[PDB]
Write a protein that binds this ligand. Structure first.
Ligand code: CLA
Ligand code: CLA
Ligand code: CLA
Ligand code: CLA
Ligand code: CLA
Ligand code: CLA
Ligand code: CLA
Ligand code: CLA
Ligand SMILES: CC1=C(/C=C/C(C)=C/C=C/C(C)=C/C=C/C=C(C)/C=C/C=C(C)/C=C/C2=C(C)CCCC2(C)C)C(C)(C)CCC1
Ligand SMILES: CC1=C(/C=C/C(C)=C/C=C/C(C)=C/C=C/C=C(C)/C=C/C=C(C)/C=C/C2=C(C)CCCC2(C)C)C(C)(C)CCC1
Ligand code: SF4
Ligand code: SF4
Lengths: 67, 734, 153, 80, 141, 33, 42, 107
């Protein structure tokens, strides 16, 4: 079974140290390897201070938004 | 611990560069960051350092007393005080030219001298201390107290008396003793002085240590106190004709509550201050016996904080767990302490000018200005330090898992709201204060001062009218005779208070106007903006979206690199450092306002301030340009006068205020790449290859250079304004 | 007569300020021919000054010892026209602006790249949104009651 | 001298090492990312502190992380 | 891999500059870079100026590691040659420095170990109160 | 000789004591145990 | 004109047009009602 | 006082029109343009007006020249890189004949 969210599921972030903390994002892809610690690649509408719109997040550092 | 000079830090000792010297100077008193440190040793070093500071305080006061006793005209000043100049100390400068010796000879002195603008003359004369031998005795006693504090600080570093970590954390017994004894018994003892000495000294006779056991401060003597007939201590209030220092018009009362000022000295009554210190002595001795120490009664501050959780959770977990984040954290203790100290220092400044306690201190005008400026700049600095130490607490000492959801973590939960609404209030105040000031600048520019926006401060005039000031016709609680406030106090203190406040010549509740409104809103802008910077650095001390790991970098660190757009001045230290600029600006505003209002009151033309304080070219022309004439003419090509030192200090403060701009504007990288060329030149210059540094000469570090620029900046700010405020107020003296 | 201020139609210092400014203008009016254009501009400024002082007389402005119109912003009805009747007229207009620029930002919030409408303003969309803020106070009121004024994160 | 500690959020892009002007960093094999490599930091004693490694780290905040610490002649960028 | 054993190879043609080894070589470590240039060509050396590196082996002694690695990256990116530099202490003991495995550090060679590596996200570091009155910091657990 | 005491102490604290302190603290700055 | 209305839609061109119109409005109001310090119209 | 700027009487800024002299209320300028115009022998506002129209003509001319020399017919690098001609022309023609024609005006 494919682990994590889907390749178009909307998600929000519970990572304290992220720029998009408590901000929603779009799951690009989830690495199905059970050895990558941060498989959930998320895409965000607004860039961070490094002019980057995406980062890999963990499964527990993420929350499938109900919208 | 280490090898080279920073023995307290083997990271700077193992630094080949000159940064070792600087950082070992700076981080010397940061005991929390030293090597091989324990909470026990930290507390013990703090205790011994407090002893050292008390020793230096008593030594500095002994020096004041000695240099007024030896080189002062204090015996001549107590004869005709309001027409004889104080003398701080003598001067032996071998660079002085003979004109400068002719000029600095003041106060009827054998040589050149310095005028005590500090008020120690007035204060010492008010508390007794008539002859110079009394000041000599005081200096000897304070030398003894300095040696006693040094003895205590050395003794409480030895193992037999090194107090334990759990003894400095006894936060109930310490409050009990300090409220009861340090605050209460000390106020009680000052009442004892004011009653046995200072009141008899004001009323003639000189009650000294040889003859104080056989003179009665009150002719009955402890009958009234023990019998409860305390009104007998308010029988003869030396009403309205008493000459301070002589028995003409004197009285017998020692604790009469009169309110208002002496008629002669325009200071408060020593009976009033005796009764005052007695009353707060009772209140502090009562408030002391509150916290449980050893005896099975009293409160535990824990179960007061733990119990103050509101149902409904509007605060959250309340103060549940806040005893531990203050008792175990010395930076919270220091932040609260400096907060209270800055508040009460500002209070000292704001009350000592309007309710002067010392004899003939309202009559010498430079003294009041120097004192208000001093205590307000001290208060602004102490407030900036309160906040800086709150930031250092949030970084070093704050444990979020110990204080989850309590009243302190809820700060960081919504820190953006606090910071953004402070950023609203300051922005509103600046936009509108500056807009009105610029509107009035342009109206006076276009020759239409009637078009000015002169918003009357109705809400402060209403408070003045709630205190008996019959200058606005509001007819409020104490300006109205038919009121409960003008009935329950009309027999006790409102006579003197009304007759003091209604006098337009004193500083008690000055008649204000629209310039006072505008400058009060400039003051509010300064306070709100300094608060914004400091609170923002304190709450973003642990981290932000730009640097969430800031807590791992400590309080003072330069930056986080050019990445992520750029992280210059991101530390909480940098917030402090920018807030010192905004603080000095704020206190410059409050003290410009004070000094111009008061120099216009003392001159006589209050209309000058009232018509000229509403537009900024009035502050530049009629205050800075006008009052600085006698200052900058302290030394002209054809001679000099006594204000030559203040002109020189004025220009000196300008020079260092400008030199701070070198370190603030010009940053590192240019200087390291300059000193590389200098090092090349020294290593290739003949007859100087012989000489070689032992410390590799690097440029100043970044955060260091922000500090050094801030130090030059503040030194120049302070020296410039001290020179201008003393020279202008001493060139004419009202 | 609040705050110890005489009215400006009765204040002698106000009339003295008027006469001083008028004499200052007339001393500059003597240097020009009475029919010339600088002289006519100075005379127009003189009538402007005179009717300015008359209008500050009739509109209930209070003048202090310095003799300048002070504004009583406390809430006295006699002086609402000094602060509150303009102030509401500010909070309306200001709240027009913010209710427009906010609404616009909500109308271009659901675009693909909504930043290229921040720098390149849709004039049709902005003109449709601008007059929505005419009666903005009821929209802001209802959006506060409906919760649409505050985002829920 | 300095302390260049890295964290497991690294994705193995090899930009922190390609920016490093002092060879502090080097990619090692690892199993925690799609690229199967992570950036170690053996030569921390050669670190000047320029933070080019973390001005090139494309994570949400950072994976490589320079903590400035005891400054030696190698870390003070001194050719003399 | 075994190091490359710095020989007494020749140096570039340079007329001398004020960017050399002042005192960090006399009493402290200085550095030396060796590169095999296929042809003789001009290059901007990091101590200011412009030198002409010879054909075959070249050797340039520099004052710090950043000069060596800056020159090396410019060589590897512009002239595409393979550089390798050392560190020579004033008593000897030439230390092989740059590749340390034969292959450049951007390539994940096996054998090199994980040093300076935390198995946690960056914001799971404990607070300074946890490591207070301890020689450890908040990033070394 | 009490108007001569400033002439004794102002150099002794201002020239001599600064030389003493600067020399001693420069030695303490460069010491190595 | 296509792509001129997009340029005139740009933030500085649009800001200068809006503030020129607005400043002319304020300027002509102050010509009509000069030297105003109260709102007496109620 | 040399004055060549008048303000509009709107918000009391009309007092910036000072008694500079000559039956004129304006801002005393400091560009020394009046001194240039006396050095040129102007002596009439018609001449200043027509050289203003001429300078507007030359502004339109330079704007059209920039449009032409970017968008319609632009030089290539062989035109700029030759500098002997650029110097010869900017010396003999711009600065040489420029000073010659100014000397002709003056004479
Ligand atoms: C009644 C007993 C008693 C008394 C008198 C004191 C007294 C003191 N303790 Mg405490 N202490 C006690 C019991 C007591 N302690 C106990 C039982 C413990 C164990 C729990 C401690 C533990 C303890 C620690 C750990 C420390 C002290 C410290 C101090 C000193 C405070 C510094 C200072 O000068 O503040 C002076 C401040 C005031 C008098 C308050 C004045 C504030 C008012 C509101 C200002 C306005 C009026 C102003 C005075 C007028 C000025 C006019 C003119 C005269 C200039 C002071 C000597 C500190 C210290 O310095 O160590 C040496 C310190 O570090 N104590
Ligand atoms: C700590 C403060 C202090 C100290 C040490 C003393 C000490 C003394 N007082 Mg003073 N006194 C004080 C506060 C103090 N008093 C205060 C606060 C008041 C006002 C209520 C008085 C009012 C007072 C009177 C009216 C008299 C004394 C007297 C005395 C002496 C006898 C006490 C039995 C003794 C020297 C008696 C005495 O013999 O005078 C020296 C005396 O007649 N005292
Ligand atoms: C009761 C007063 C009080 C006390 C006990 C302390 C004590 C301390 N402060 Mg605080 N501070 C205070 C007032 C106080 N300060 C005030 C009034 C301000 C505002 C200007 C500050 C602003 C401040 C900052 C911004 C910082 C401290 C820091 C510190 C610590 C180290 C001191 C150091 O390294 O410099 C010792 C100072 C010198 C050797 C002299 C430096 C030269 C100055 C400019 C002029 C003298 C120490 C715990 C530092 C800290 O926590 O370490 C990270 C820190 O960063 N303080
Ligand atoms: C005269 C100098 C000056 C001025 C005007 C300000 C102004 C301000 N500072 Mg301070 N600041 C200064 C010097 C100054 N600073 C210095 C020397 C330092 C030390 C580095 C700091 C450090 C500092 C910090 C650390 C912080 C501030 C903050 C602020 C803002 C406070 C809110 C406020 O009053 O806004 C009201 C607005 C003004 C006073 C701006 C004045 C300009 C007018 C009103 C705008 C319109 C002008 C004009 C029409 C534009 C046309 C020109 C052009 C387009 C052609 C504001 C922008 C705080 C902040 O920004 O948070 C809110 C803050 O946190 N400043
Ligand atoms: C911190 C307190 C303090 C301060 C700021 C000063 C300041 C000064 N003193 Mg004084 N002094 C003090 C305490 C102080 N004194 C004490 C406690 C004593 C008694 C031992 C003296 C005895 C004293 C003498 C006898 C002389 C000075 C002199 C001076 C001046 C030059 C410095 C030398 O002094 C030397 C410093 C000491 C002896 C203090 C050691 C502790 C200077 C104005 C000189 C002077 O009058 O110049 C005009 C001078 O001749 N001082
Ligand atoms: C060339 C300029 C110059 C110099 C060198 C001096 C020198 C002096 N003047 Mg000044 N003076 C000058 C120009 C100068 N004057 C001019 C132009 C005027 C205007 C007419 C005056 C007006 C003037 C007055 C009015 C007075 C002096 C006084 C003094 C003496 C200070 C006593 C002393 O050394 O205490 C010790 C010095 C200090 C405490 C100040 C130094 C503070 C340091 C920098 C801060 C601390 C740093 C750190 C903790 C310690 C590091 C050093 C360490 C190694 C010891 C001293 C001889 C005073 C005097 O003679 O009274 C005794 C005095 O009252 N002067
Ligand atoms: C923030 C501070 C501040 C404040 C409060 C003021 C306030 C004022 N200034 Mg000052 N001024 C300021 C800053 C400030 N200024 C600054 C910074 C400068 C320098 C740039 C000036 C320079 C200046 C000059 C030189 C002059 C003023 C003048 C004025 C007055 C404006 C009269 C006017 O034309 O408005 C009239 C009202 C408007 C223009 C608003 C009209 C808005 C439109 C038409 C919409 C309203 C209708 C709307 C549809 C709602 C209707 C309700 C319903 C039917 C829908 C007023 C007292 C003038 C004056 O009279 O002096 C006292 C004047 O000559 N000011
Ligand atoms: C808006 C008011 C205004 C205007 C339009 C002018 C215009 C002029 N003045 Mg006058 N002047 C003014 C105000 C003004 N001045 C004031 C307040 C004073 C002080 C009393 C003077 C004093 C004065 C003197 C003494 C002299 C002039 C002269 C001149 C002329 C030459 C200067 C020139 O071309 O500027 C060129 C200036 C620049 C290119 C600098 C940059 C300015 C930029 C373009 C402003 C852009 C503003 C924009 C609308 C808004 C912000 C844009 C955005 C970036 C945010 C010109 C006719 C001279 C002359 O010979 O007159 C015939 C002369 O000698 N003026
Ligand atoms: C950062 C931080 C910190 C610091 C902070 C600060 C520094 C603060 C400050 C603060 C302040 C500085 C405050 C103040 C306040 C004040 C108030 C709050 C007031 C009140 C008042 C009242 C209430 C009054 C009343 C009255 C009157 C009106 C008069 C007469 C009498 C009576 C009584 C009636 C800490 C450490 C804490 C912690 C951490 C964080
Ligand atoms: C002010 C101005 C203006 C105007 C100006 C002008 C008008 C100018 C002119 C100019 C001119 C009008 C010029 C001319 C020139 C000429 C020349 C430069 C000539 C030369 C000649 C020669 C060189 C010769 C030779 C010869 C001879 C000798 C003889 C015969 C033969 C021959 C021909 C060969 C304008 C509007 C623009 C505007 C701006 C300013
Ligand atoms: S730059 Fe960051 S993500 Fe890329 S290899 Fe280095 S540590 Fe990993
Ligand atoms: S700070 Fe500079 S030298 Fe240190 S690891 Fe990062 S890139 Fe390399």
């Amino acid at each position: 079974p494919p682990i994590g969210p889907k390749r178009g599921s909307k998600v929000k972030i519970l990572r304290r140290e992220s720029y998009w903390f408590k901000n929603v994002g779009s799951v690009v892809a989830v690495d199905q390897d059970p050895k990558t610690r941060y498989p959930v690649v998320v895409r965000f509408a607004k860039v961070n201070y490094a002019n980057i719109s995406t980062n890999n997040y963990a499964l527990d550092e993420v929350e499938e938004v109900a919208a | 611990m280490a090898l080279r000079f920073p023995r307290f830090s083997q990271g700077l000792a193992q630094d080949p560069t000159t940064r070792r010297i600087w950082f070992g100077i700076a981080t010397a008193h940061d005991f929390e960051s030293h090597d091989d440190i324990t909470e026990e040793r930290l507390y013990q070093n703090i205790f011994a350092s407090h002893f050292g500071q008390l020793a230096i305080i008593f030594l500095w006061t002994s020096g004041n007393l000695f240099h007024v006793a030896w080189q002062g005209n204090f015996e001549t000043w107590v004869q005709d005080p309001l027409h004889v100049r104080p003398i701080a100390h003598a001067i032996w400068d071998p660079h002085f030219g003979q004109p400068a010796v002719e000029a600095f000879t003041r106060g009827g002195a054998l040589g050149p001298v310095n005028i005590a603008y500090s008020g120690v003359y007035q204060w010492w004369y008010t508390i007794g201390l008539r002859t110079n031998e009394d000041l000599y005795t005081g200096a000897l006693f304070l030398l003894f107290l300095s040696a006693l504090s040094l003895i205590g600080g050395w003794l409480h570093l030895q193992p037999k008396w090194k107090p334990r970590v759990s003894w400095f954390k006894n936060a109930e017994s310490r409050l009990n003793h300090h409220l009861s004894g340090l605050f209460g018994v000390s106020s009680l003892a000052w009442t004892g002085h004011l009653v046995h000495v200072a009141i008899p000294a004001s009323r003639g006779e000189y009650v000294r240590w040889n003859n104080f056991l056989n003179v009665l401060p009150h002719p009955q003597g402890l009958g009234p106190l023990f019998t409860g007939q305390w009104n007998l201590y308010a029988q003869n209030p030396d009403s309205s004709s008493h000459l301070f220092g002589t028995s003409q018009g004197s009285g017998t009362a020692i604790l009469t509550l009169l309110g208002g000022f002496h008629p002669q000295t325009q200071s408060l009554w020593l009976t009033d201050m005796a009764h005052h210190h007695l009353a707060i002595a009772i209140l502090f001795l009562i408030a002391g016996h509150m916290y449980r120490t050893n005896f099975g009664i009293g409160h535990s501050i824990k179960d007061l904080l733990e119990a103050h959780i509101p149902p409904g959770g509007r605060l959250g977990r309340g103060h549940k767990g806040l005893y531990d984040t203050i008792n175990n954290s010395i930076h919270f203790q220091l932040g609260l302490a400096l907060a209270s100290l800055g508040v009460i220092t500002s209070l000292v400044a704001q009350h000592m000018y309007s309710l002067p306690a010392y004899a003939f201190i309202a009559q010498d005008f430079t003294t009041q200005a120097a004192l208000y400026t001093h205590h307000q700049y001290i208060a602004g600095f102490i407030m900036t330090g309160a906040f800086a130490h709150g930031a250092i607490f949030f970084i070093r000492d704050y444990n979020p898992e110990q204080n989850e959801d309590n009243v302190l973590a809820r700060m960081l939960d919504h820190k953006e709201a606090i910071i953004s609404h402070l950023s609203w209030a300051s922005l509103f105040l600046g936009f509108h204060t500056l807009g009105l000031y610029v509107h009035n600048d342009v109206m006076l520019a276009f020759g239409t001062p009637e078009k000015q926006i002169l918003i009357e401060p109705i809400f402060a005039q209403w408070i003045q009218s709630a205190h008996g000031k019959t200058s606005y016709g509001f007819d409020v609680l104490l300006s109205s005779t038919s009121g409960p406030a003008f009935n329950a106090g009309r027999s006790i203190w409102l006579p003197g208070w009304l007759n003091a406040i209604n006098e337009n010549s004193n500083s008690l509740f000055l008649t204000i106007g629209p310039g006072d409104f505008l400058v009060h809103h400039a003051i509010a802008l300064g306070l709100h903006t300094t608060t914004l910077i400091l609170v923002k650095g304190a709450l973003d001390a642990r981290g932000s979206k730009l640097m969430p790991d800031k807590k791992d970098f400590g309080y003072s660190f330069p930056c986080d690199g050019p990445g992520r757009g750029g992280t210059c001045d991101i530390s909480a230290w940098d917030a402090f450092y920018l807030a010192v600029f905004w603080m000095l600006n704020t206190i410059g505003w409050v003290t410009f306002y004070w000094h111009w209002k008061h120099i216009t009151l003392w001159q006589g033309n209050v209309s000058q301030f009232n018509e000229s304080s509403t537009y900024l070219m009035g502050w530049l022309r009629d205050y800075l340009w006008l009052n600085s004439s006698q200052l900058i003419n302290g030394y002209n090509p054809f001679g000099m006068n006594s204000l030559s030192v203040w002109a020189w200090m004025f220009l000196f403060g300008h020079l260092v205020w400008a030199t701070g701009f070198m370190f603030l504007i010009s940053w590192r990288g240019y200087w390291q790449e300059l000193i590389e060329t200098l090092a090349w030149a020294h290593e290739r210059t003949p007859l100087a290859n012989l000489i070689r540094w032992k410390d590799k000469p690097v440029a100043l570090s970044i955060v260091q250079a922000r500090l050094v620029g801030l130090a030059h900046f503040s030194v120049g700010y302070i020296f410039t304004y001290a020179a201008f405020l003393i020279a202008s107020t001493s060139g004419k003296f009202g | 007569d609040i705050s110890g201020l005489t009215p400006c139609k009765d204040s002698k210092q106000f009339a003295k300020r008027e006469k001083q400014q008028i004499k200052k203008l007339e001393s500059s009016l003597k240097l020009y021919a009475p029919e010339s254009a600088p002289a006519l501009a100075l005379n127009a400024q003189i009538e402007k000054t005179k009717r300015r002082f008359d209008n500050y007389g009739k509109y209930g402005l209070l003048c202090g010892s310095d003799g300048l119109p002070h504004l009583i912003v406390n809430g006295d009805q006699r002086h609402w026209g000094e602060f509150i009747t303009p102030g509401i007229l500010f909070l309306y207009i200001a709240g027009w602006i913010g209710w427009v620029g906010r609404s616009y930002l909500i109308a271009i919030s659901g675009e693909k790249k909504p930043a290229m409408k921040e720098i390149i303003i849709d004039v049709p969309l902005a003109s449709r949104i601008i007059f929505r803020g005419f009666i903005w106070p009821v929209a802001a009121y209802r959006e506060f009651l409906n919760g649409d004024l505050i985002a829920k994160d | 001298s300095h302390s260049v500690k890295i964290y497991d959020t690294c994705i193995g892009c090899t930009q922190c090492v390609r920016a490093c002007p002092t060879d502090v960093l080097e990619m090692i094999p690892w199993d925690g990312c799609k690229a199967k490599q992570i950036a170690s930091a053996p030569r921390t004693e050669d670190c000047v502190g320029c933070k080019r490694c973390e001005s090139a780290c494309p994570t949400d905040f950072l994976s490589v992380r320079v903590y400035l610490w005891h400054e030696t002649t190698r870390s003070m960028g001194l050719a003399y | 891999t075994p190091p490359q054993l710095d020989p007494n190879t020749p140096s570039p043609i340079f007329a001398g500059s004020t960017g050399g080894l002042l005192r960090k070589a006399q009493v402290e470590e200085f550095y030396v870079i060796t590169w095999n240039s296929p042809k003789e060509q001009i290059f901007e050396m990091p101590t200011g100026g412009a030198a002409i590196m010879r054909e075959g082996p070249n050797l340039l002694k520099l004052a710090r590691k950043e000069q060596c690695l800056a020159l090396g990256t410019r060589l590897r990116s512009k002239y595409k040659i393979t550089y390798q530099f050392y560190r020579v202490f004033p008593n000897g003991e030439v230390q092989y420095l740059h590749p340390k495995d034969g292959v450049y550090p951007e390539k994940a060679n096996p054998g090199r170990e994980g040093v300076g590596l935390n198995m946690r996200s960056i914001g799971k570091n404990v607070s300074p109160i946890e490591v207070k009155f301890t020689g450890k910091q908040s990033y070394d657990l | 000789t009490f108007n001569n005491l400033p002439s004794i102490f102002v150099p002794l604290v201002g020239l001599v004591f600064p030389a003493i302190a600067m020399a001693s603290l420069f030695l303490h700055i460069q010491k190595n145990k | 004109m296509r792509d001129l209305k997009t340029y005139l839609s740009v933030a500085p061109v649009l800001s200068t047009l809006w503030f020129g119109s607005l400043a002319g409005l304020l300027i002509e109001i102050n010509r009509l009602f000069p030297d105003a310090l109260t709102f007496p119209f109620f | 006082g040399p004055s060549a700027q008048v303000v509009w009487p709107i918000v009391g800024q009309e007092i910036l029109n000072g008694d500079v002299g000559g039956g004129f209320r304006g801002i005393q300028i400091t560009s020394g343009f009046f001194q240039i115009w006396r050095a040129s022998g102007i002596t009439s506002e018609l001449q200043l007006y027509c050289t203003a129209i001429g300078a507007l003509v030359f502004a339109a001319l330079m704007l059209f020249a920039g449009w032409f020399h970017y968008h319609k017919a632009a030089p290539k690098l062989a035109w700029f890189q030759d500098v002997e001609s650029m110097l010869n022309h900017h010396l003999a023609g711009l600065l040489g004949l420029g000073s010659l024609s100014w000397a002709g005006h003056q004479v």
